[PDB]
Amino acid sequence: LMGLFNRIIRKVVKLFN
């Protein structure tokens, strides 16, 4: 579970970096 969110973490890391 939380795979949705973990994926979002990297999707946001894209806008973070």
PDB file of N, CA and C in Angstrom:
ATOM      1  N   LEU A   1       0.851  -1.211   0.000  1.00  0.00           N
ATOM      2  CA  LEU A   1       0.000   0.000   0.000  1.00  0.00           C
ATOM      3  C   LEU A   1       0.876   1.247   0.000  1.00  0.00           C
ATOM      4  N   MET A   2       0.241   2.411  -0.160  1.00  0.00           N
ATOM      5  CA  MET A   2       0.933   3.705  -0.202  1.00  0.00           C
ATOM      6  C   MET A   2       1.751   3.857  -1.481  1.00  0.00           C
ATOM      7  N   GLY A   3       1.617   2.895  -2.392  1.00  0.00           N
ATOM      8  CA  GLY A   3       2.348   2.941  -3.645  1.00  0.00           C
ATOM      9  C   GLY A   3       1.960   4.146  -4.469  1.00  0.00           C
ATOM     10  N   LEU A   4       0.687   4.518  -4.367  1.00  0.00           N
ATOM     11  CA  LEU A   4       0.172   5.718  -5.018  1.00  0.00           C
ATOM     12  C   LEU A   4       1.016   6.903  -4.609  1.00  0.00           C
ATOM     13  N   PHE A   5       1.103   7.059  -3.298  1.00  0.00           N
ATOM     14  CA  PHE A   5       1.729   8.203  -2.684  1.00  0.00           C
ATOM     15  C   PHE A   5       3.233   8.192  -2.921  1.00  0.00           C
ATOM     16  N   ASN A   6       3.851   7.016  -2.798  1.00  0.00           N
ATOM     17  CA  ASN A   6       5.292   6.877  -3.042  1.00  0.00           C
ATOM     18  C   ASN A   6       5.627   7.306  -4.453  1.00  0.00           C
ATOM     19  N   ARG A   7       4.729   6.990  -5.376  1.00  0.00           N
ATOM     20  CA  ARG A   7       4.912   7.347  -6.755  1.00  0.00           C
ATOM     21  C   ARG A   7       4.801   8.862  -6.903  1.00  0.00           C
ATOM     22  N   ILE A   8       3.874   9.449  -6.147  1.00  0.00           N
ATOM     23  CA  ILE A   8       3.684  10.892  -6.134  1.00  0.00           C
ATOM     24  C   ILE A   8       4.924  11.590  -5.584  1.00  0.00           C
ATOM     25  N   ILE A   9       5.575  10.962  -4.610  1.00  0.00           N
ATOM     26  CA  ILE A   9       6.787  11.519  -4.013  1.00  0.00           C
ATOM     27  C   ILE A   9       7.847  11.768  -5.084  1.00  0.00           C
ATOM     28  N   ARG A  10       7.920  10.862  -6.050  1.00  0.00           N
ATOM     29  CA  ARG A  10       8.881  10.986  -7.140  1.00  0.00           C
ATOM     30  C   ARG A  10       8.349  11.910  -8.222  1.00  0.00           C
ATOM     31  N   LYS A  11       7.032  11.981  -8.333  1.00  0.00           N
ATOM     32  CA  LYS A  11       6.401  12.867  -9.302  1.00  0.00           C
ATOM     33  C   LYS A  11       6.561  14.312  -8.844  1.00  0.00           C
ATOM     34  N   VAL A  12       6.511  14.506  -7.539  1.00  0.00           N
ATOM     35  CA  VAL A  12       6.743  15.812  -6.956  1.00  0.00           C
ATOM     36  C   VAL A  12       8.235  16.111  -6.889  1.00  0.00           C
ATOM     37  N   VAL A  13       9.053  15.070  -6.823  1.00  0.00           N
ATOM     38  CA  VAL A  13      10.485  15.246  -6.750  1.00  0.00           C
ATOM     39  C   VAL A  13      10.973  15.791  -8.081  1.00  0.00           C
ATOM     40  N   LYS A  14      10.176  15.515  -9.096  1.00  0.00           N
ATOM     41  CA  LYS A  14      10.384  16.030 -10.426  1.00  0.00           C
ATOM     42  C   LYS A  14      10.209  17.546 -10.460  1.00  0.00           C
ATOM     43  N   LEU A  15       9.256  18.066  -9.683  1.00  0.00           N
ATOM     44  CA  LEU A  15       9.039  19.501  -9.631  1.00  0.00           C
ATOM     45  C   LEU A  15       9.883  20.118  -8.519  1.00  0.00           C
ATOM     46  N   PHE A  16      10.333  19.266  -7.608  1.00  0.00           N
ATOM     47  CA  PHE A  16      11.189  19.685  -6.511  1.00  0.00           C
ATOM     48  C   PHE A  16      12.599  19.940  -7.024  1.00  0.00           C
ATOM     49  N   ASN A  17      13.066  19.035  -7.873  1.00  0.00           N
ATOM     50  CA  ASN A  17      14.388  19.152  -8.470  1.00  0.00           C
ATOM     51  C   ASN A  17      14.303  19.899  -9.793  1.00  0.00           C
TER      52      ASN A  17
END
